[PDB]
Amino acid sequence: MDKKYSIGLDIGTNSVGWAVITDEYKVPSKKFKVLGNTDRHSIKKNLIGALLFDSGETAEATRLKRTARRRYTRRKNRICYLQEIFSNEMAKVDDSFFHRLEESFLVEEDKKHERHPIFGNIVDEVAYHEKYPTIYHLRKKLVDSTDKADLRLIYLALAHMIKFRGHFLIEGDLNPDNSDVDKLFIQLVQTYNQLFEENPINASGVDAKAILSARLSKSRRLENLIAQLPGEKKNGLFGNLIALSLGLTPNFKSNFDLAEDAKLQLSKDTYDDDLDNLLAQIGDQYADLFLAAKNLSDAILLSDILRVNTEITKAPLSASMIKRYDEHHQDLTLLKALVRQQLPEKYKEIFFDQSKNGYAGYIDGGASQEEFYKFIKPILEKMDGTEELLVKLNREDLLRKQRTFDNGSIPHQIHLGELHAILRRQEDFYPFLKDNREKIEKILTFRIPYYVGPLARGNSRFAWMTRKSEETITPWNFEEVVDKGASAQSFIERMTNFDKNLPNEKVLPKHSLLYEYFTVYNELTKVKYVTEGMRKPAFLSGEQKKAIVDLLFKTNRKVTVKQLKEDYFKKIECFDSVEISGVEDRFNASLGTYHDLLKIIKDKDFLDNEENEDILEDIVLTLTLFEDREMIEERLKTYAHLFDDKVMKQLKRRRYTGWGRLSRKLINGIRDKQSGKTILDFLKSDGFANRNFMQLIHDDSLTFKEDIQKAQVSGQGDSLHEHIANLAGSPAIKKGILQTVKVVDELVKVMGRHKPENIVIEMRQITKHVAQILDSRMNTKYDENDKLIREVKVITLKSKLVSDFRKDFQFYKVREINNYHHAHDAYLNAVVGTALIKKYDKGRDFATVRKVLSMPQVNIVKKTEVQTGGFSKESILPKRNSDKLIARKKDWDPKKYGGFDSPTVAYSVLVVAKVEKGKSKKLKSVKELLGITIMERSSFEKNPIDFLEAKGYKEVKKDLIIKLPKYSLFELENGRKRMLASAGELQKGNELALPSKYVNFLYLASHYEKLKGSPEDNEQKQLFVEQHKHYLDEIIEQISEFSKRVILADANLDKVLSAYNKHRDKPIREQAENIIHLFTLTNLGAPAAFKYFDTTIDRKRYTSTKEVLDATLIHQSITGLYETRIDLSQLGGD
DNA sequence: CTATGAGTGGCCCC
DNA sequence: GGGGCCACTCATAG
RNA sequence: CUCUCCACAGGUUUUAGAGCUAGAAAUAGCAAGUUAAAAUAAGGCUAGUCCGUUAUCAACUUGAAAAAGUGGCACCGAGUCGGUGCU
DSSP: OOEEEEEEEEEOOEEEEEEEEETHHHHHHEEEEESSSOOOOEEEEEEEEEEEEEOOOOTTHHHHHHHHHHHHHHHHHHHHHHHHHHHHHHHHHHHHHHHHHHTTTTTTOOSSOOOOOSSSSSHHHHHHHHOOSSSSHHHHHHHHSSOOOOHHHHHHHHHHHHTTTOOOOSSSOOOOTTOOOHHHHHHHHHHHHHHTTTTTTTTTTHHHHHHSSSSSSSHHHHHHHHHHHTTTTTTHHHHHHHHHTTOOOOBBBHTTEEEEEEEOOSSTTTTTHHHHHHHHHHHHHHGHHHHHHHHHHHHHHHHHOOOOOOHHHHHHHHHHHHHHHOOOOHHHHHHHHHHHHHHHGGGHHHHHEEEEEHHHHTTTTTTTTTHHHHHHHHHTTTSSSHHHHHHHHHHTTTTTTSSSGGGOOBHHHHHHHHHHHHHHHHHTOOHHHHHHHHHHHHHHOOOOOTTTTTOOOOOOOOOOOOSSSOOOOOTTSHHHHOOOHHHHHHHHHSOOBSSSSSSBBBETTOOHHHHHHHHHHHHTTTEEEEEOOSSOOOOOHHHHHHHHIIIITTOOSSSSHHHOOOOOIITTTSSSEEEEOOOOSOOOOOOHHHHHHHHHHHHHHHHHHHGGGGHHHHHHHHHHHOHHHHHHHHHHGGTTTTHHHHHHHHHOOOOOEEOOOOOOIIIIIIOTTTOOOOOOHHOOOOOOTTHHHHHHHHOOOOHHHHHHHHSOOOOOOSSSSSSSSGGGGGGHHHHHHHHHHHHHHHHHHHHTTTOOEEEEOOOOHHHHHHHHHHHHHHHHOOOTOOOBOOEEEEEEEEHHHHHHHHHHOOOOOOOOSSSTTTHHHHHHHHHHHHHHHOOHHHHHHHHHHHHHOOOOOOOOEEOOOOOOOOOSOOOOOOOSOOOOOOHHHHTOOHHHBBBBBBOOOEEEEEEEEEEEEETTTEEEEEEEEEEETTTTHHHHHHHHHHHHHHHHBBBBOOGOOEEEEEEEEEEOOOOHHHHHTTTTEEEEOOOOOOOOHHHHHHHHHHTTTOSSSSSSHHHHHHHHHHHTTTTHHHHHHHHHHHHHIIIOOOOHHHHHHHHHHHHTTTTHHHHHHHHHTTTTTTSBBBBBOOTTTTTEEEEOOOOSSSGGGGGGEEEEEESSSSSEEEEGGGGGGG
């Protein structure tokens, strides 16, 4: 008989539960054949289990690393270009100079030339370092001196500028006009006034440059600037913005009434993510305010760095850094004198001990500036004459280096100016500098446009550039080889996000005019008004909505309910008293783009004319797509006949960011067949119905739902490769879905290839997508009428049903005991789903469920994965006399140069061969696990025998090489199991099966004061907990027995037992909350540390893999029902 | 008598 | 989080 | 929610920046310290101002791979599954 059955599933991010049940909710048990060379021919297993795997990773880290690699390659290429230019003239001076520069890294033994790179003789090196203690002294010398200079020094300065050319955020020629502190402060005030028109700040008469750039501490400058603004507080939003500009860490919680703390700091690398999180909670209308704050911060940092402005010169940065060097020298001398005079004992700890956070650790060690200031602050306060030193420490200017993290704000125009000054002064003596000045300036300033991408000949999957010819792309002929227009067109066709509602179309910009109209009309659709004499609230009519928009939304950036009441209902419709529902204080929608374009173009008729909609949409799209001003001008050049020069100039400067959620074809592209109206047309006026956006797409009376269903293409989703990205979700859930489909395939295989009646899936639109994926792969029958035959029905259930089922019928869930709960959730999902389907014998069902939940044999499978990723840790360690350091190059011996350490093992291979041991070089047969690291994987797979022979293994048996990826399972005596974490470490592999009564007791005792139910039920549960306190002893006894049997952690187990007796009088709730922590000792996976009351139990690591070389290797399928057991003790025998 | 492997504790991770 | 590595002490064993 | 591009500032590593005096040496005292070069996943051939950390992967047979194929059923029970019966 064909047993009708269903497959229940519980898809997660790290686990994929699965279970097979019959019509009676019983999980069948079948006897499975076991292959391999062991005596166990057959094993009986229950058809229930769970699959565990590592979480999926997103491509963010790989993308960052790839971008970094490209940056490094292109910087190397710039230096190569400069050396190519200088190559001809350098040979006449010192031909080996470029070789000596390249070989500076090597030790004296590996150097082919003289060890001094610049001049090659020690006298000239000493003279150079005495005359130019830093590179900035040389830079100032070249900028200022008219005398003929040495060509090597010119190359050094030019290469130092080109290699560290600074940021590109400031756009266009010039710089001092954009760098005004006053200008950006005025812009910030204007932005704040625009966002907070009700509370304008009068910034007139405020000398922002004098206050913000003065030599005071950050808090003092903040307070001084606030004091000049009447009515303002240092705790206000503007005060917090100024503090953020000055480099402090203000809290925005009070200014936005947020639940959690909102602290931002521009110096932190995570500023972008925190700002995105803050904007997602406060709204994206404040992005311009934070951009203005960042710009003001950059201006402040530049004014702090380029202190020297009075003296007439053309290299301000060089003079500023020389000034910092002089200040550091003076303060160091003063500090040495004072410390020697007053604290002779601490002189060594400050100036000699590199392990401390003193000056010695600040310079020769790894101490940063913050740690150095922390270490030096208390010492100065204990000494006399340190007033000025304390002031500088409060200013963060004491003993300050030149190459610090502050230099991230210096524009590339300053470096370009210094480069131009050098090239102008020194070209009189060296003709090739004069002939190549433009080339060097281009090499410094040329930046590959972000819309051209990698410059590949097709052999890169990331490239979209189109080539006019086949010449090599250099900074000087980029424009002649690359077609910038075609590249931009390809970049638009590739980048733009596809709409989710209509997959083929492209979403509109978030600031698009049509999008703003759509939002305004959607919000106005559900507005109700109540006037005197009206029995029920009424919706706004189409003419009413149009009048409201024209009178308020086209005149005010933000419109509130009170404004509507006093401006439209009263002034226009003569309603003295009106009540409005659906909007509390203000409308979220706003015609911000409309107001900006009215400010720029200054033609309201042009904006309100529907004939001009396409032009405005294209202008907004062009502004949102691109950032380079050349493209912005080029694309807008088609509209030059419609606007004057000033309007076009103002349009060129306006920029937009972000994309919306809906496409133009969805809103105003598709039309209802019966009426011809779009979604926007119905939003403007729908008569008495007044349907909103969601209603329009779901109303069966309109063709919108049919068109959405037709345009959207039901695809394979996951389980078809290169088509998974078509689905929408995190990569981890995609991995879970793929594993789920594989599990379903193997389960159908096991049960005699009869497809299940039902497939209950549990994890919303992603669940539905999974549903049609499994439906498509399940049903393969087409009738003559083309209707699908529903042999398999996929049902999706909410987790709340299962939660109520657990809490109501005492099938309590405790996560910490073991990983059995995944399979149990899957089984309960299946039971509930089948019950509801049968709707559309309580005692027997309850007994069956309780019996199934108490089964100790559950097929937990840990998915074996061949590790990939970084070769080793990214820290470069100092040289050591150790053989575990990895060379960074082929010819860089780690004993001399240091290098990477801690490589990651891809997989281990069992090696049966003979190795020479001892000084006698005697051949001895050995059998061990050898770890094949990720770096060596390709070489191993290319020729395993040669790779093993290179490691000293001789007489290698090729047939006995066994591939053992991570989490390979070995079975040892008394059922003890260990999973291979790496070639030199193991993991726990056994699962504790507590009886259900202990699980219920622990669940009730842990939530003793947190039960959610009727008071009588809570009293009953408390009484039950108090009655069965002796279960604590039984739980401890079972933990001890299981540990002694399979864990073998005698020391830690004794510690736990001793601590248990110590706190036996503790409250029962605390005892349960602490015992639940004890199961970290027995949980599957890597050992972990845990706290039992006040006692911390350190983790027990299994650092020996010799014990598994004589155990039973188990190859488990994805479900674990099919397995092949290999007894390694029979391999390698004599 | 000294060279070799075996476990335990602690530090470390752009 | 969890695997790698080093220093110290212990067992081994020619 | 996901994917992609262009740049910046650091940081680490080795070398260069002549250490002096008293002392046979161990060592003690003193002087100095702020910068630069090179590398930043080993490398690869398709030789590009390209690619190299995402995704996928139990065992056996066919293959280069994609990919395909390989493992009887019913009942009574449960400490990681056991027993009984038919084929």
